[PDB]
Design a protein around this nucleic acid. Sequence first.
RNA 1: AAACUUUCAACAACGGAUCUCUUGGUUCUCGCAUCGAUGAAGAACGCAGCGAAAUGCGAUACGUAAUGUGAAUUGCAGAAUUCCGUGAAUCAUCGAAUCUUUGAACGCACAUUGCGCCCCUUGGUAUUCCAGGGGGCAUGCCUGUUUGAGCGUCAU
RNA 2: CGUGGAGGUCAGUGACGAAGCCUAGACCGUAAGGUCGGGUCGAACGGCCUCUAGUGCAGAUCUUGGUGGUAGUAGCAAAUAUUCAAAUGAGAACUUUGAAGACUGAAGUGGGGAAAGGUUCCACGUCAACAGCAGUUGGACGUGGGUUAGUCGAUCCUAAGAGAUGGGGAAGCUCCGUUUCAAAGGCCUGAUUUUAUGCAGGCCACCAUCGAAAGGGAAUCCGGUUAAGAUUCCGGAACCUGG
RNA 3: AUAUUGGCGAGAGACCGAUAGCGAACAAGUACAGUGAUGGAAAGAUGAAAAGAACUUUGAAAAGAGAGUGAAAAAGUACGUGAAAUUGUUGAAAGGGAAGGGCAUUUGAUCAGACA
Lengths: 58, 49, 125, 84, 71, 207, 50, 118
Amino acid sequence: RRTITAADRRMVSGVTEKQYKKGMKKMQQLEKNAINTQIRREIKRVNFQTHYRDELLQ
Amino acid sequence: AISKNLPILKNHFRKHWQERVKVHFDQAGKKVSRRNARATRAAKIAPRP
Amino acid sequence: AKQSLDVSSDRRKARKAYFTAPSSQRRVLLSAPLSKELRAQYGIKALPIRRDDEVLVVRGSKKGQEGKISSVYRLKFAVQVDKVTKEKVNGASVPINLHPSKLVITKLHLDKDRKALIQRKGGKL
Amino acid sequence: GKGTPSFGKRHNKSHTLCNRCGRRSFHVQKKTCSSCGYPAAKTRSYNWGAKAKRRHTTGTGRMRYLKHVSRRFKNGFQTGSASK
Amino acid sequence: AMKKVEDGNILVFQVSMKANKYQIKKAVKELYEVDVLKVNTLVRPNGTKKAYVRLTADYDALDIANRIGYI
Amino acid sequence: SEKAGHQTSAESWGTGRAVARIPRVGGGGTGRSGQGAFGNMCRGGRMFAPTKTWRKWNVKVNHNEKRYATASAIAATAVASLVLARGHRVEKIPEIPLVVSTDLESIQKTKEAVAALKAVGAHSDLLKVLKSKKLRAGKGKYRNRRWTQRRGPLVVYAEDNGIVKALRNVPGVETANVASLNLLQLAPGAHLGRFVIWTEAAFTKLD
Amino acid sequence: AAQKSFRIKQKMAKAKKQNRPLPQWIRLRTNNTIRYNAKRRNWRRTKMNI
Amino acid sequence: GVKAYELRTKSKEQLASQLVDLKKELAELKVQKLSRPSLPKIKTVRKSIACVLTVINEQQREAVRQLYKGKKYQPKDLRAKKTRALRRALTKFEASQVTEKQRKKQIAFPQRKYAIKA
RNA sequence: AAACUUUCAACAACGGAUCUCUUGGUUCUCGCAUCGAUGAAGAACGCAGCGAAAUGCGAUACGUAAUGUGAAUUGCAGAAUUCCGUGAAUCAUCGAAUCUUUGAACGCACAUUGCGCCCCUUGGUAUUCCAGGGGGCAUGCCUGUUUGAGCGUCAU
RNA sequence: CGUGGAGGUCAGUGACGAAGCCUAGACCGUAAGGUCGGGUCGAACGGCCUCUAGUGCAGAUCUUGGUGGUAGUAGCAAAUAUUCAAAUGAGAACUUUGAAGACUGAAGUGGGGAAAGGUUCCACGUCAACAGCAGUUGGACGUGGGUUAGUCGAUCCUAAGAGAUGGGGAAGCUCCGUUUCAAAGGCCUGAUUUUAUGCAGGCCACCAUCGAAAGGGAAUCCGGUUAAGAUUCCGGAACCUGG
RNA sequence: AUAUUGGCGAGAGACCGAUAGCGAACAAGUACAGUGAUGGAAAGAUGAAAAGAACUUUGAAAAGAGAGUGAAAAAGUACGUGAAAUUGUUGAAAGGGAAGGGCAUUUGAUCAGACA
Ligand SMILES: [Zn+2]
């Protein structure tokens, strides 16, 4: 006897599985849209080592 | 420096004078406070000066 | 104009006080005028709006339509009217989010604690 | 190597959680939080850590009791049943 | 857990974290009117506590689980 | 704020690299690490010569210059060429140093005051005001200066009984005593000329 | 580790109950500005230092 | 539901029984919440329990008050919680004390009130 | 001659400036004086019919009581004329309560959900062992009480 | 000349479309710049007299943001090695099963554990992103389940050491010191329960506390069982401590 | 009488107007880094109202095309307008180891005013 599933809880509380799938995919889209910006605005000042030793004298 | 024919002028701003500045914007905002205080006191002591 | 010192002429403060008003102050912002018959009968001009009040619309695309209130959505500052709806593309219907200032009360959901309000405001039965 | 090889050996802590500020500052060999010296009764707060005071001073929490004091003063620190 | 009710005479409960295997014994004795011989507690990883109580023979757990209303 | 642009802890890295010598944030794991700071050029930085409060806002003027100007601005009210040239509609006025009766000082209703001013011919200069209500331009209309009107006449009493409250509400019209007369009412925008409506008591006290 | 303490198992449980997405019914409310869960965490990317 | 102004008319043992016959209900509804997706009836029971316990405690506190009337020292829980400073500060009587010299001076030469005109 | 390269325009793209807006900031002024051993500030954990946060709250857990207004909440479900009423509400006010583990932090201790002692009570054959429940056990200092120490010292 | 705001004024323009933007389309001025038409767009904006300033950029190895040629290029080459058929699937060099060939070769590419990590374990569904190729797979996405102890460990002991008290220093944050220069404490009867201890009643001067999941240490083994737990559950047979 | 960048409540500004103004207009002392002290961001706007694209059809699906809502999808949650760098398609033109620019005119395009 299992008269409950998470799909059934969210069905009772509004969202259908179609709404769930679509809204999930949008929330996945936005995370990547932001990760793009964090990888974009970082490559400049990420290789700015404080104490590089430069293995070249002779 | 010393550049031209100008007066020797003594100006005491070698300390951190910018902290110890007081601009009196309160002049009129507190003139009225004094007036109100006089007016209140005068009713507390209603016949007395 | 204003002559006190405890009331503000500040756009910022006023709009904040609107869009963060509680549900108990919003009751009075969501007020509506009475029809010219109830102005003559009850002796007042306006009242706060309440469910189960009949109403008429005077301004909008749905002008002339009359109904009665089904829900005062005093989070959207709105009010919904029976016999005033719109058919969504699905075939279904969704009601219209009116605003009370563009309404006119024709019949009143009278009750104790509204007869009293009318009485204190200088009204009649 | 002083870098990449010698960063493999970093597997034993020196700081643990403090009971007073909840963050990993409780030193274990000397038993003294580096953000609010826990066995000491006084919280660390230096006037040069003017940003650090913002992060840990009043307002930054719930203010369980304190935020009703201004309400209770406005009314006169009063008592008893309200009214009818 | 609904296997261990039929296989053994074992009931699985969720209990407060401040409970100590004696309180549980006496609570079961009080609420469900049974006898207990063994309690095994663990702390789940969601910060709750789980209690496997084993009832004496002369007490079947299915009867008690139906009487409670969860089989 | 005096602490703007200085809440940051930053120091230059120096010569030896391919970047400038501007102060730069240190640390990692966020976008600010490496960013420039403390300068006028820098985003997040301060400004050039931050504006202080010990600037001269209010200015002293000599009492006799003030009075010279007030008398000139009073004398200009009697000149119709300046009044007309300043934006006042007084083409249908009998006599310009307009002197109405002192019973205007006893009026207590706006409904009556406005009728009086219409009778003595200010109707056009009130229409001018309430037809000129245009919206402000710029970032001053979310700073409590949304509207702009034109100025109206200036009623100059000597002993107020309700006129200053009656005309309190009508747009444009101001109200003054013969004493306590204001250059910012007589010469607005430094523009000489103003339609003034005197009472006979005021006119007699002006001597 | 395995031989751990309750003070840490507590804080791991909290992080387990926090490691979920956002409920889709939050996005349907009226004056909503929450698009996603911006405080998410997984063991690969960000270690919680405890 | 359950209501305070109905419960105040009830006694200690009745309320103690109402608690139990509510907690049983809550224990049942916490089972039904498993085999069903939503149970909002549960909230009324939680708030009912609270409304019961509140009344019980308030009765018991009033009892100890009536026990400690007139007795000079009553418990800290029952004493008024003004601020620490206002509990440490001086009493209205202790502060309005005077030396005999000063009260004699006050009764002899008080601040008369007066005015300036013939 | 095409392709290619370059210049301009149209349309579409990358990107998010400008324009308009602004429940925010900053500065000035006015008034007020209100933390804590009656256990503060801060922290940890937890709580919702469906919430990870923020906000609120504490096992009475997005809250109970009281007072006021007087019919909502609303994303969904679920309740409902209880709506001419002791009365809805993520309302307002707030004077009664609760207020987990903590923390100046107070039995000892704490990288431990570690180890005790006292009183009352319940159960187990039980002043002695075990368990449960309730209430207590810090230090310095003051006033007073009680018991004492000292050929310091008086009298008999 | 131009810019952001302020005071006046044109009873100024404007949803019949303000501002902004584009325009090898026009006009004016030496020029700064202004003006017009068209397209786009959608709500406020200008001219004149004056005031005021956070007022005009090609640069500063300027700051922030974004973007290019390089360039579909360098390159994705350590760790002996992959192949056939079928199934699933929209789709298979890479998934699964079977068949073959091979490797690690017991100081292992095995089986388990300490630190540390934190649910990565297991199942169902799923592949937008990640797995620098791919992907029907996955330590990924989503939803859930899952860790059972009288005997294993902590807990207890002390080590190197840390650290209160009494005290002494110190402007003070606090430092020394851990038995010191302290009035530092509890255990059994006649009294046979008045349990008070009048006597009894003697017995060192010891004198916090923390400090090891590898040291010291009270006690357990077999078999079976799960999707994922077991010296922990089930069956059976035993042991220790305290009463 | 005096002081007051803190706290509580209020009123205002020739101030800033989202690279500005507090670091923070938004779940900001947040995410994140670091053993730790400490450091410390970015991120606002659909539309009046979700009416947030029913239904058909190609595709394994995302999606596309129609249809529809709307005042307007030249507003489709990657949404106010939507610049430039940079890029694609179309059109015009040119081009023997650079291109661009000044004076002068031809040729092509385009504008003109029409003195109508
Ligand atoms: Zn701490």
